Design a protein around this ligand. Sequence first.
Ligand code: NAP
Ligand code: NAP
Ligand code: NAP
Ligand code: NAP
Ligand code: K
Ligand code: K
Ligand code: K
Ligand code: K
Lengths: 225, 226, 226, 242
Amino acid sequence: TAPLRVQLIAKTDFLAPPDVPWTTDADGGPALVEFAGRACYQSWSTATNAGYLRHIMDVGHFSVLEHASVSFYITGISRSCTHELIRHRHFSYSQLSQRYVPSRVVVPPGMEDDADLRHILTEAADAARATYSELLAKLEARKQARQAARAVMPNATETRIVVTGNYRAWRHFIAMRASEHADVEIRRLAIECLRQLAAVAPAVFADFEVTTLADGTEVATSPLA
Amino acid sequence: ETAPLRVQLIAKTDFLAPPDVPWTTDADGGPALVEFAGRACYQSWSKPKTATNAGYLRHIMDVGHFSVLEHASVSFYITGISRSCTHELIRHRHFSYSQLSQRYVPSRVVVPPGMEDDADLRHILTEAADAARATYSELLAKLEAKQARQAARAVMPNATETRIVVTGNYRAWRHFIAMRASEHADVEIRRLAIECLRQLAAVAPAVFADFEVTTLADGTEVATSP
Amino acid sequence: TAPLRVQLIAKTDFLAPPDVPWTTDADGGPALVEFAGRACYQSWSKPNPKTATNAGYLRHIMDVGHFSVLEHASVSFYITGISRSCTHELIRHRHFSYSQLSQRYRVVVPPGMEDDADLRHILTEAADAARATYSELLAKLEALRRKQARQAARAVMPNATETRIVVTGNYRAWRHFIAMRASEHADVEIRRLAIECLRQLAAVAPAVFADFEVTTLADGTEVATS
Amino acid sequence: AETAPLRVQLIAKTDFLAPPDVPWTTDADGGPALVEFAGRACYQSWSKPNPTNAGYLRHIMDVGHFSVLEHASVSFYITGISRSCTHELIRHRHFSYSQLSQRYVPEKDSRVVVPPGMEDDADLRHILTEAADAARATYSELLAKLEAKFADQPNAILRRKQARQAARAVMPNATETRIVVTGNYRAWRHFIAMRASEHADVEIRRLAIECLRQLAAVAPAVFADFEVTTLADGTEVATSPL
Ligand SMILES: NC(=O)c1ccc[n+]([C@@H]2O[C@H](COP(=O)([O-])OP(=O)(O)OC[C@H]3O[C@@H](n4cnc5c(N)ncnc54)[C@H](OP(=O)(O)O)[C@@H]3O)[C@@H](O)[C@H]2O)c1
Ligand SMILES: NC(=O)c1ccc[n+]([C@@H]2O[C@H](COP(=O)([O-])OP(=O)(O)OC[C@H]3O[C@@H](n4cnc5c(N)ncnc54)[C@H](OP(=O)(O)O)[C@@H]3O)[C@@H](O)[C@H]2O)c1
Ligand SMILES: NC(=O)c1ccc[n+]([C@@H]2O[C@H](COP(=O)([O-])OP(=O)(O)OC[C@H]3O[C@@H](n4cnc5c(N)ncnc54)[C@H](OP(=O)(O)O)[C@@H]3O)[C@@H](O)[C@H]2O)c1
Ligand SMILES: NC(=O)c1ccc[n+]([C@@H]2O[C@H](COP(=O)([O-])OP(=O)(O)OC[C@H]3O[C@@H](n4cnc5c(N)ncnc54)[C@H](OP(=O)(O)O)[C@@H]3O)[C@@H](O)[C@H]2O)c1
Ligand SMILES: [K+]
Ligand SMILES: [K+]
Ligand SMILES: [K+]
Ligand SMILES: [K+]
């Protein structure tokens, strides 16, 4: 079995143009966003970065968020969870090839509780791999064949993925997938991205707050989204 | 228990020429709209080497004006496609999709193309699917003793049939075919691409007839365009 | 001078699949949209009375925020009597396809000036002078590839110069354009364009565009909001 | 009137933070290192046959896995670009833009961008700046008249904005604008392919050649396949076999 890991692997380096009479108390993506917004009116003379970013989002000028981007390397995510994930446009993805073969399985969050459920699951995964080898043997009598014999692998099979999005795309991913209407695995992932995103871009994600349900899981909601 | 691939064309363009523009052409529908949009850039309504619709469309493409193709679109309803093939399919930007919900439970499996002529493999596959389903019901019962179903769904194989409405403009279809109807493409997605092509060539020959379909010695078809 | 004209030139042609056990009291885009939404759950029999009409189903789709299903249907307009600066603001919207009157090829009067003959005459005279300048530059610049001259000479043409455009989008993209551009915060020319598109869209797809209400302001200009 | 030269400033690029737990290192940082990491993550190919970042990137290009290039991005602040050239630029999707507001009118004098084909001719340049001055004069005449005509209408703040919006109807194509443009490597490669060619008009061709210069510096392997050649007219073009 494999646990969810979300690692932040890239963010924006910001290099302020020396000839613009403007400065700010921020660096990186948060600084770039303010610069871009101010560029629209050449308003170089909401006087803190935080307050400027707060204002931008109140006034609904969200396109300025698109200039700054963040990438994560995500492991311990199920095939079915990634299928939901890649439905989002305005992200770029690089995913582990289906042709690749180590059985690593991701336990659904509702089942992580239980030894019997967990055992039923890994057993089923072992049975699938056994079938995979049987299908491959008879089939090859070659590289595409390998991919095609993975017809038998379960939804819970682990995959790994590099995801990159601008701040605007991340905020929409979190608004959609960290709600009660989303399944628990992608919601779990969405809350973990938000956590890491707030560490690098607090001002950008300040409007999201996390509510821990009685049900046990966490949800994220914003008045702007 | 096994579901064959079926691709059904469900939508295309209804073109309505504006009366106030001094132009007609030997075409209707999507191909007529594409010519209209191309002509709009220069107001070349009165049109002599590109004065037919098919000639005009070929020229647009020869000269690399592919954005004019974006105005016309086609939708398919696709059944008998594996969950795993659809995962490859939805990596394509510039399409719109509506997919059979994860939370749907009929067991129906799609046979990988290279396993279709093999009775032994067909049987190993369908028995596998029966075992996964048995396991689904065992997990689900024990889990209850929406979320429970989402959790039990963890054991369902990649070969499980899904169903999808896919909508794309001609430019998007042309790129999908180029990419997915080649040698290097996975067999299930390649078969889908050649089926889509066949039907697209039927409704809009001037846009899609530049694709040459050839059979490989292995039995599968490939499409290539100059 | 050139007045605004918006002509609907293309819309979706829907072909229901005969092998699917479903009909609806609509056709074209609204029918395609309903089919796509229903395909997600295979809800072909229409068990719910509230959504057993096309309008009812579409209303529910949007209440429930399933806006991605609107992406399947599209509408194209041909737009004339639109200034260069207004089209610049239009083409900022992504998820649209455009074909615009070429740069290698009449003024539109600002709506707040339309009733004032003195103001209109100041503008047309300025446009006349600019056009004189363009001719003087064009001649001096020429003194095939000698279309480099026209590219350079256009430097003097004003914002108010008319352009022409074919715009295609799906219903989801149109709804967003209207919501952003039909509000008071947008300048009057793009707002006027958004309201006219809304009118024509609500005529073809009422259930999809009904929630937009058009109100009039104190200057005799219109706004729309959902 | 005053004339603005083209200035393209790189204001942002990718910062790459290697995950400590992955058994891999490379001889690069930033965007190029991220692209390699993402390409290797597809196959978990952390260890090498053995005996460079630039070699891996060429491999990625040569196998046509261009989607891996989408992970790294660069942003430029561009000034001294005409409103017409920016109209052409923003047609490109897969970029994000923030542009000087259509409203903005420079307080001190008109700023215009001379078409490159006119750069070497004092008479042509004078006709253009004279035209630009006459448009500004018309602008101020229209604005004052509009503000007068709107004197009794409600919301005087709104009326000022609307007066400005209508009056700018006369401003020419050559008017200077400024823009922040952000794209991933894949989007930049296509912008260069399309706009650094013979077909492209000279003002946008100039811009694309300059973006290329600065892109080639930050990521040489990603942009190496483009070759710049000068035409008989003294103008540069970039082509790639890819
Ligand atoms: N191991 C895996 O399973 C794996 C992992 C990662 C990626 N992938 C691949 O990713 C592919 C997606 O297909 P595709 O990208 O060729 O075509 P696509 O998504 O259909 O998009 C068509 C074209 O639009 C452009 N484009 C789309 N999104 C862009 C973006 N975000 N930034 C810059 N340009 C963008 C590219 O054009 P131009 O470059 O010509 O301008 C692209 O060729 C799949 O075929 C899949 O094979 C696979
Ligand atoms: N079985 C199912 O439950 C099922 C089936 C199919 C799809 N889906 C849903 O599809 C969703 C994908 O997310 P999403 O589309 O909200 O956000 P998204 O893909 O992350 O895209 C972000 C935004 O870009 C705009 N957009 C993207 N592509 C567009 C297009 N082709 N035409 C017009 N506008 C476009 C929309 O903005 P605006 O509209 O605000 O302008 C959208 O909200 C998932 O949330 C998933 O739940 C579910
Ligand atoms: N007369 C005029 O002034 C005029 C009028 C209209 C348009 N245009 C032209 O339109 C061009 C836009 O550039 P471009 O589209 O080639 O590159 P682009 O916008 O930079 O997009 C890059 C690639 O993404 C794909 N793509 C983007 N949006 C798409 C969509 N809606 N549907 C299908 N594919 C899409 C295409 O790839 P693939 O096809 O390879 O899959 C395209 O080559 C401008 O360069 C301009 O010259 C000019
Ligand atoms: N000086 C100026 O006034 C100035 C300068 C530059 C730009 N702009 C603005 O840029 C605007 C463009 O409109 P728009 O972006 O609202 O809608 P859009 O281009 O029509 O696209 C529709 C939706 O798709 C999503 N989207 C599109 N491209 C995206 C991307 N690259 N990254 C992440 N998400 C993306 C956003 O949805 P979600 O956030 O809901 O997910 C957006 O609301 C214009 O309205 C203009 O006001 C203004
Ligand atoms: K977004
Ligand atoms: K495409
Ligand atoms: K949209
Ligand atoms: K691109």
